[PDB]
Design a protein around this ligand. Structure first.
Ligand SMILES: Nc1nc2c(ncn2[C@@H]2O[C@H](COP(=O)(O)OP(=O)(O)OP(=O)(O)O)[C@@H](O)[C@H]2O)c(=O)[nH]1
Lengths: 416, 455, 157, 346, 360, 175
């Protein structure tokens, strides 16, 4: 087997603690489907037939709860109380690993051709292959963050070669004292280094098996994205030849099989990257990213699963002429007459009365809205209920919260 | 509103002692590279690029520079490049020259700033057009355009002293950071470069400094304002103080054209080798761009340039990349390769010359073995003399018979450190180092710190 | 439309009279050209009268579609034969012919534009217009071509 | 006025020859040289033909030494010298000419010649200027005369191979393509890949054209019916100084007995034999062959970039000029009636 | 799905070469294949990706890479319960070779290695256990690499050491590992000579050779192929490497090799060809048109000045780019062939094959 | 051979008539029935048309021990014309046409048919003083042959000796 796909899905949401309380992060309903469905579905269209999904008890229960795929997952549970990292999870599931690993994350919504990365892993015999997207700017208001309060957002400095594929430099602004230092010999080997700051890490690493073998004998590394990848990039130019990473490489490079008796146009560790400047590639880890992904999902869902209609078959809508093309309706979801839904995703088992305008909103399951209520650019959690004529704009209402009738709360996080 | 004719400011003084003690008796701009003075190379480059007025600023040995210039091709009435010589004893840096340029109001529009030791065939028309377009679109923002040449860091024309690393916004070719990598093993770039441009902040170490600039008069104005300012000081101050003054420095990179500065002996050797091997075409030894009767030659196979009235001994072999000055007499069974020999030289029999540069009037006795050595005007070498690599003999220096001067040895008629400390007790020529009938003094690491001794 | 008229009054040139011609075809005896100043009447530049030195091919010095200044050496109004020589034309005569042709063409263009404005449709109308305006000045000043242009220049002011 | 402008124009021409040359073609080079020589004849003061010839030779020596590879300047200088000789002999009472000027067995047997240019004739200048004007007129149509012979050397569905970018060959092929259909294969002629441009223009005319590197000349020659090339210079024995890689193309054509046709005008004929002179090839900077970004590898490697190739006359089948078609064995005659042997060495 | 989709032709081809495929390096075959490699073994997919992108080039390198990939395929082979190894392995290897051909037309060395491996697999007894057969096949492949390439190269270098003399000027073309090894070992053993490296667009493989010749300290000149006629007066010997030697004696090599042979013959210069006997073929070619490879036409674009000629060359309907890869040198232009059997005439190819076939 | 090639390829065939027995005409008709673009010409135009011919493919009656050919008349001229233009000459002959007889002499090489084919009997008295000869076969030396295509594959003419030794015994050369 060439690869063994692994989905890292313990659950984060450090910047989404408001939503990661009613349900785990992998189970967030992006486009009327759980979030973890989007990575796995990718592996379906690619051709995978076996995954090692490291999750918790609830996510494993959800995975067996009539989840829709054709491949057979191998769900592995971990002690929730125990604190671990992604590298720790790889250390845990090491006995199941026999070939090269393809590590993903349960937040990546993308329409990228996976081969674009995997070919970089194949042709160049790369130790590591990464996927990044060009930096993008969010111009739409986050539902809940309105008084600025913008963080510093320590940028990642990524220096690639002239070809735009090889990874030469990788640093984080937190570790730099206002000075980006280059080793010098790196510039001697690669005189030109393109530098990017806004690149988004999609967490789609393709790691060789000896990387995990080296991870076995080293416990200092706990995270893959923050520690393993920068360590590999640094060791790329850390000369050659606890035990170092270079001792675990015991396979001859396919590009240098016979150093003599043949011509091929020291560098054993090689990290490559694919920077995709166009198309959809999002990592749902913030409220704004989640809302943007919900907004842009309908085209992806129409392309990936044309069989599924945008409106569920078992949906009772009196006004079946006031729903936008991008709007999605889940199962049940009784919607009354004279109710207009424009570019909004509606969950399942939702109670919608008449004279309700849902503009650019995200409604979860068991969401009730009464007569005359208008919602614009807002997110409703599970089991939440809306009273008569309540006007909501850019608000995050938590699970089971009750809003007073005709209470015009705007840009307020209503969390109980 | 057509721009006025292009003008150039040529600095004929290096304002440093990088050629000591050879510069004690001869200005740097008059040192013959392939039998042609460096200032002639610079003036030919300026004339070819379309410069109509040239201001030559001479401080050190300005009389000799003026005397040489008056006889040159560019001081003739038929020349389209009018050369005006300005001399002063109060010049100590390029800052002084540019401050005097501002005080005299010599330049009204964009001009060329070069030193008198720049060898190049670059046509500046494209870079000048880009500079003018940038200044037209954004008024008085971009003030200087430096010219760089694509090169690998391992090329022999890239000494560690003049190596630079540039952080550049590749979208607009704007220089954001400029640093010199002499003695460094880890280059530090401030994060302030990554403020506005989120895509192109290319860190380039493949740029060779041609030391050619297209400067607006704002450059002279800023040199006057900042009286503490060399060009590197100006560039660093401009890049640091971009907040106070919204001035910018851009760059133009040429790949198909040659350009370099002879700032030390290593660069001199590299540039001479490149010139002999036609890397600066059409500035080749046979082209006779100086229009002098004594500097004409014919170019045979293997880049062998032979002048008129050159006698070659029987059995002599000129391997490759050899330039022979007019009137040179070479003995029998000689082996000359990668060497430049000036006019009037006399070479004995069974003499081996490898990567050596003999200037006018050098006499070499039979049986000598010279490798990577420079022999200045009228130097003499006796029999059974071996010169190890990077050995320099200055003017009127004689080396006695049966010696083997080690690597890095410099022998000059000037005392090694007497007048250096004095800046009276005539010291005899030590035969233990210059031999019998040897005239000169061994010049140790006191002046060797910036001589032909490096990687 | 295709309105055309002679630049001068007389319908045919005279011997020893430098004229502007346009080469139209190549033949055995010489180059068949059209006289530009005389309503494009046929003439022949003789092969013998082409160069003082020996010439091997007529195409060496004659290109189809190129104007030439040639001196008339033989006129037969009955047969319609006009013989032209390029060897006998001096450079000063060529310059004079060029200037005269330029002036005459300017006058002809002015008169043709006037006729087009007046919606003239036949060459007889253009000939009459030339009779009234240009050739009157030409034979008043006793200088064909020059006189009409000089009189027109005397106008405006 | 006269001198202050004439000397300035001479200096400008010499400097342009020394450094560059611009996009100037061979026809433009010849026209400018002829204009220079005409102004020298008109403006400068010369009493007899001897002084004029000495002055013209003195100017031509400098013009030629400016750029030896540009032989059109020397060709035009020698043409003007021959014109002066012819006019003076005509005015000196020698009856027929262009035959006694050249050494001949019949001339040697039946007498000889005793040259003397000391006599003064007031009508010499006008005759010389008229002859130069005739030369310029011929220059204005030499290209059309060459192109007019296209249909006599190309048949239907023929494969024609060419190297480099020659405007004469381009006009020849475009004239042929109006009435005929044929396939053209152009070698790129590295390092200056001018052939690429030659392939684009021929493609704009609707001609089925194919581009290939110089390495594939021998491989493709087996299926090539005719070879049509330009040249920079035609030497006195019929040899060629063409673009680099033309000798290889000629050898490949000779292997398959493919005819090789050289479309070159009259002013490209130079009376200089390829004896030696060490001034045949023109070596441009080695930047075109090996880039400067190679690195330290360049400090021990000898890179040479010759521009021109010498093609011996044995490999040439036909010369097409404005005067028609000739064999390489007749070129000597075209020498004798164009240039005087005493003017071979300026 | 089960069959790999055929690679698409890039652009219009020359009418005389319209029977050969023409592919673009950017359009790879892996776009429509499953990332977990099914149908085609992952080693074969990686090898084909390296072939189609030009990462692995040269006859010896391609053959060695193919043999290593085949070793990997054999190691991961399980015999079906109702099948025999001798037939099932041969049947299984065929789609892999078809995919490799789609990625890039196979070199002669690769074809000969494939034939040898198929013969070895067929000659496996049905009574042998699976693991024993796999170990024997891997040992056979290792022996093939060791004897047909490494020891052959050493013997060829020893033989060619005799021809090289002091003061010689040897002209080499392109990149050939055998030629580079011969020159390096001759320089090490004490011979003093110059090497002139002739290079050609667009691969510029000769630069490779140049670099090696400087690491060994050999003096080296460098120039392009059109200037060959200028340098051949100095040259005393031409030393070429061959991608294949055909049964009629023809030398199938990189395009321009026959050109150099012709010009060298015109300049009266001996031409020697270095080839391992494992690259001798039973096919025959009389020209470079019948069988050849058409590389990416876009590689013919060059950067001259600020403009780029041939940019958007597909917009011109009558414009075709011909990036020929190989060419055939007739045996009359070759003076000598140096093989592990010694120095032989160019007409001794058919006999050597026979000598290498009576054993098998 | 040509009909097999024409199934997947398009090419133009030029057939010389091979006078006096103009069998080439029939060869041109059959190739025309297969859709192959074919052209007929006399033997006088071989050299004129050879300049535009890429390949030559011929049969033979006998292959001699040194690789030479005993082909139809006019084949030596065709081989010379091909050698002038360096056009490859391919001989498509099976194995049983190989004869171990060297072309030393034996005065039995050519086959002289009646001169009726060359000069008709109706010429008259002109035939009583005119010597008419009609050879049928031509000797083609091996230097003008590029390749032999037989049922065992392609070979050079320089390898034919080996095909002799493994087919015939030297003691059986002279029956
Ligand atoms: N298997 C496993 N997955 C984890 C673990 N911690 C977080 N994850 C998930 O795996 C993804 C990749 O890890 P990181 O990108 O480093 O996440 P993080 O460090 O917790 O930072 P945040 O994404 O902001 O929460 C995260 O998005 C989490 O959802 C873990 O310990 N084990």
């Amino acid at each position: 087997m060439e690869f063994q796909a692994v989905v890292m899905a313990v659950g984060g949401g450090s910047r989404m603690t408001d939503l990661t309380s009613s349900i785990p992060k992998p189970l967030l309903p992006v486009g009327n489907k759980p979030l973890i469905w989007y990575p796995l579905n990718l592996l379906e269209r690619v051709g995978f037939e076996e995954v090692i999904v490291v999750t918790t008890r609830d996510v494993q229960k959800a995975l067996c709860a009539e989840f829709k795929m054709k491949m057979k997952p191998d769900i592995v549970c971990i002690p929730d109380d125990a604190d671990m990292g992604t590298a720790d999870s790889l250390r845990y599931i090491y006995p199941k690993l026999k070939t090269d690993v393809l590590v993903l994350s349960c937040d990546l919504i993308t329409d990228v051709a996976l081969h674009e990365v995997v070919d970089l892993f194949r042709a160049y015999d790369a130790s590591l292959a990464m996927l990044m997207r060009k930096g993008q700017d969010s111009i739409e208001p986050v539902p809940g963050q309105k008084g600025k309060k913008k963080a510093v957002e320590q940028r990642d400095f990524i220096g690639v070669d002239s070809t735009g594929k090889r990874l030469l430099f990788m640093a984080n602004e937190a570790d730099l004292d206002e000075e980006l230092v280059i080793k010098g010999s790196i510039l001697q080997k690669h005189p030109r280094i393109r530098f990017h700051t806004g690149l988004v890490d999609a967490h789609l690493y393709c790691l060789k098996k000896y990387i995990v073998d080296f991870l076995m004998e080293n416990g200092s590394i706990t995270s893959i994205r923050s520690e393993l990848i920068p360590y590999l990039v640094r060791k790329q130019f850390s000369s050659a030849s606890s035990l170092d990473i270079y001792s675990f490489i015991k396979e001859a490079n396919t590009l240098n099989l016979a150093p003599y008796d043949a011509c091929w146009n020291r560098s054993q560790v090689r990290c490559y990257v694919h920077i995709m400047k166009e198309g959809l590639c999002s990592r749902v880890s913030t409220l704004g990213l989640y809302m943007e992904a919900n907004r842009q999902v309908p085209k992806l869902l129409s392309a990936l699963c044309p069989e599924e209609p945008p409106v569920h078959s078992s949906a009772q809508i009196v006004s079946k002429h006031l729903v936008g093309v991008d709007s999605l309706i889940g199962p049940e979801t009784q919607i009354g007459e004279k109710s207009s839904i424009k570019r909004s995703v509606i969950g399942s088992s939702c109670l919608i009365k008449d004279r309700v305008t849902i503009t650019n909103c995200l409604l979860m399951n068991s969401v009730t809205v009464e007569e005359g209520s208008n919602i614009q650019g807002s997110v409703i959690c599970n089991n939440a209920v809306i009273e008569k004529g309540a006007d909501i704009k850019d608000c995050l209402i938590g699970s089971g919260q009750r809003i007073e009738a005709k209470a015009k709360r705007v840009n307020e996080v209503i969390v109980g | 509103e057509p721009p006025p004719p292009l003008q150039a400011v040529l600095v004929a003084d290096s304002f440093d002692r990088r050629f000591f003690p050879i510069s004690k008796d001869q200005p740097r701009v008059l040192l013959p590279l392939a039998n042609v003075a460096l200032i002639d190379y610079t003036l030919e480059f300026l004339t070819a690029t379309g410069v109509q007025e040239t201001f030559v600023f001479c401080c050190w040995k300005a009389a000799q520079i003026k005397e040489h210039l008056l006889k040159s091709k560019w001081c003739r009435p038929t020349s389209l490049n009018v050369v005006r010589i300005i001399t002063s004893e109060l010049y100590r840096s390029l800052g002084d020259v540019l401050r005097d340029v501002d005080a005299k109001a010599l330049v009204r529009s964009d001009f060329l700033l070069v030193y008198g030791d720049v060898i190049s065939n670059i046509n500046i028309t494209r870079a000048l057009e880009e500079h003018r377009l940038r200044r037209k679109l954004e008024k008085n923002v971009s003030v200087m355009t430096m010219i760089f040449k694509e090169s690998s860091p391992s090329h022999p024309t890239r000494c560690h002293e003049d190596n630079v690393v540039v952080a550049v916004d590749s979208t607009t070719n704007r220089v954001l950071h400029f640093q010199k990598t002499q003695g460094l093993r880890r280059f530090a770039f401030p994060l302030s470069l990554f403020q506005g441009s989120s895509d192109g902040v290319e860190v380039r170490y493949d740029l060779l400094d041609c030391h050619i600039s297209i400067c607006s008069p704002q450059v002279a104005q800023l040199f006057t304002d900042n009286f503490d300012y060399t060009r590197d000081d100006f560039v660093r101050g401009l890049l640091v103080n971009e907040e106070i003054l919204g001035n910018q420095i851009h760059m133009h990179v040429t790949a198909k054209e040659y350009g370099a500065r002879v700032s030390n002996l290593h660069m001199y050797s590299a540039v001479c080798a490149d010139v002999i091997r036609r890397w600066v075409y059409p500035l080749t030894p046979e082209a006779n761009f100086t229009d002098s009767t004594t500097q004409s030659c014919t170019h045979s196979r293997h880049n062998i340039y032979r002048g008129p009235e050159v006698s070659l001994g029987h059995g002599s072999i000129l391997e490759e990349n050899v330039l022979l000055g007019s009137g040179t007499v070479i003995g029998s069974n000689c082996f000359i390769t990668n060497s430049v020999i000036g006019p009037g030289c006399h070479i004995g029999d069974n003499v081996v010359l490898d990567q050596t540069y003999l200037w006018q009037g050098v006499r070499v006795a039979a049986g000598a073995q010279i490798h990577q050595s420079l022999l200045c005007d009228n130097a003499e070498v006796k029999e059974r003399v071996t010169l190890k690599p990077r050995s320099v003999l200055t003017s009127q220096v004689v080396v006695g018979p049966n010696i083997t001067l080690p690597e890095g040895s410099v022998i000059s008629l000037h005392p090694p450190d007497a007048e250096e400390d004095e800046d009276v007790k005539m010291k005899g020529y030590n035969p233990a180092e210059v031999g019998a009938a040897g005239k000169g003094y061994l010049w140790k690491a006191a002046g060797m710190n910036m001589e032909e001794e490096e990687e | 439309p295709g309105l055309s008229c002679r630049f001068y009054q007389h319908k045919f040139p005279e011997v020893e009279d430098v004229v502007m011609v346009n080469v139209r075809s190549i033949a055995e005896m010489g180059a068949y050209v059209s006289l530009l100043e005389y309503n494009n009447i046929e003439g022949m530049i003789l092969l013998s009268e082409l160069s003082r030195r020996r010439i091997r091919s007529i195409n060496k010095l004659i290109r189809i579609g190129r104007n030439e200044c040639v001196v008339v050496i033989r006129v037969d109004k009955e047969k319609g034969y006009i013989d032209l020589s390029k060897r006998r034309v001096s450079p000063e005569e060529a310059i004079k012919c060029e200037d005269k042709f330029t002036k005459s063409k300017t006058v002809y263009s002015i008169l043709r534009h006037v006729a087009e404005v007046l919606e003239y449709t036949k060459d007889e109308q253009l000939e009459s217009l030339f009779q009234r305006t240009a050739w009157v000045f030409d034979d008043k000043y006793k200088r064909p071509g020059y006189g009409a242009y000089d009189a027109f220049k005397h106008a405006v002011s | 006025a006269k001198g202050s402008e004439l000397s300035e124009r001479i200096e400008s021409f010499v400097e342009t020859l020394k450094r560059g040359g611009g996009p100037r073609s061979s026809e433009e080079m010849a026209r400018e040289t002829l204009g220079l020589l005409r102004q020298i004849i008109t403006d400068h003061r010369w009493s007899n033909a001897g002084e004029l010839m000495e002055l013209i030779r003195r100017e031509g020596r400098r013009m030629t030494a400016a750029q030896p590879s540009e032989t059109t300047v020397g060709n035009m200088v020698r043409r003007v010298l021959k014109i002066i000789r012819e006019e003076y002999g005509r005015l000196h009472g020698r009856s027929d000419e262009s035959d006694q000027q050249e050494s001949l067995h019949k001339l040697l047997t039946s007498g000889g010649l005793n040259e003397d240019f000391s006599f003064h004739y007031a009508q010499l200048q006008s005759n010389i200027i008229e002859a130069i004007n005739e030369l310029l007129v011929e220059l204005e149509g030499t290209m059309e005369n060459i192109a007019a012979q296209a249909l006599e050397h190309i048949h239907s569905n023929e494969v024609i191979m060419t190297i480099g970018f020659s405007r004469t060959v381009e006009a020849f092929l475009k004239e042929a393509a109006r009435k005929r259909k044929f396939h053209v294969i152009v070698a790129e002629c590295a390092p200056f890949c001018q052939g690429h441009e030659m392939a684009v223009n021929l493609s704009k005319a609707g001609i089925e054209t194919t581009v290939m590197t110089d390495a594939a000349i021998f491989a493709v020659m087996s299926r090539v019916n005719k070879v049509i090339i330009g040249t920079k210079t035609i030497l006195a024995n019929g040899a060629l100084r063409a673009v680099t890689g033309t000798h290889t193309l000629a050898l490949a054509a000779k292997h398959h007995s493919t005819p090789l046709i050289v479309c070159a005008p009259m002013f490209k004929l130079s009376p200089q034999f390829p004896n030696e002179e060490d001034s045949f090839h023109k070596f441009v900077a080695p930047e075109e062959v090996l880039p400067f970004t190679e690195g330290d590898i360049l400090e021990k490697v000898s890179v040479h970039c010759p521009v021109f190739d010498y093609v011996p006359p044995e490999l040439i089948t036909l010369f097409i000029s404005n005067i028609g078609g000739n064999a390489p064995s007749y070129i000597y005659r075209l020498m004798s009636e164009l240039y005087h042997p005493d003017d071979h060495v300026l | 799905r089960q069959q790999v989709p055929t690679r698409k032709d890039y652009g219009s081809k020359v009418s005389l070469f319209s029977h050969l495929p023409q592919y673009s390096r950017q359009n790879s075959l892996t776009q429509f294949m499953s990332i977990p490699s099914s149908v085609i073994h992952p080693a074969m997919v990686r090898l084909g990706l390296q072939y189609s992108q030009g990462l692995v080039s040269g006859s010896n390198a391609r053959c060695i890479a193919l043999l290593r990939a085949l070793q990997q395929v054999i190691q991961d082979y399980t015999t079906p319960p109702n099948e025999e190894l001798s037939r099932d392995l041969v049947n299984k290897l065929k789609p892999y070779m078809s995919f490799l051909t789609q990625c890039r037309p196979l070199s002669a060395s690769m074809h000969n290695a494939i034939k040898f491996l198929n013969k070895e697999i067929t000659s496996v007894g049905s009574s042998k256990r699976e693991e024993e057969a796999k170990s024997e096949l891997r040992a056979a492949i290792d022996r093939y690499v060791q004897e047909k390439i490494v020891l052959a190269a050493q013997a060829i270098s020893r033989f060619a050491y005799q021809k090289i003399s002091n003061g010689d000027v040897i002209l080499v073309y392109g990149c050939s590992s055998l030629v580079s090894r011969i020159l390096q070992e001759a320089w090490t053993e004490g011979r003093r000579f110059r090497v002139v490296v002739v290079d050609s667009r667009p691969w510029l493989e000769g630069r490779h050779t140049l670099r090696s010749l400087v690491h060994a300290g050999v003096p080296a000149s460098y120039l392009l192929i059109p200037a060959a006629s200028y340098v051949l007066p100095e040259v005393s010997k031409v030393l070429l490497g061959a991608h294949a030697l055909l049964a009629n004696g023809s030398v199938m090599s990189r395009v321009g090799t026959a050109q150099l042979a012709l010009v060298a013959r015109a300049h009266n210069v001996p031409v020697l060809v270095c080839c391992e006997t494992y690259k001798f073929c039973e096919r025959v070619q009389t020209d470079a048109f019948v069988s050849n490879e058409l590389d990416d036409p876009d590689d013919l674009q060059c950067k001259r000045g600020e403009h780029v000629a041939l940019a958007n060359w597909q917009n011109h309907a009558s414009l075709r780019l011909l990036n020929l890869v190989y060419d055939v040198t007739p045996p009359e232009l070759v003076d000598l062939v140096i093989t592990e059997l010694g120095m032989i005439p160019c007409s001794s190819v058919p006999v050597v094959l026979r000598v290498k076939s009576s054993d098998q």
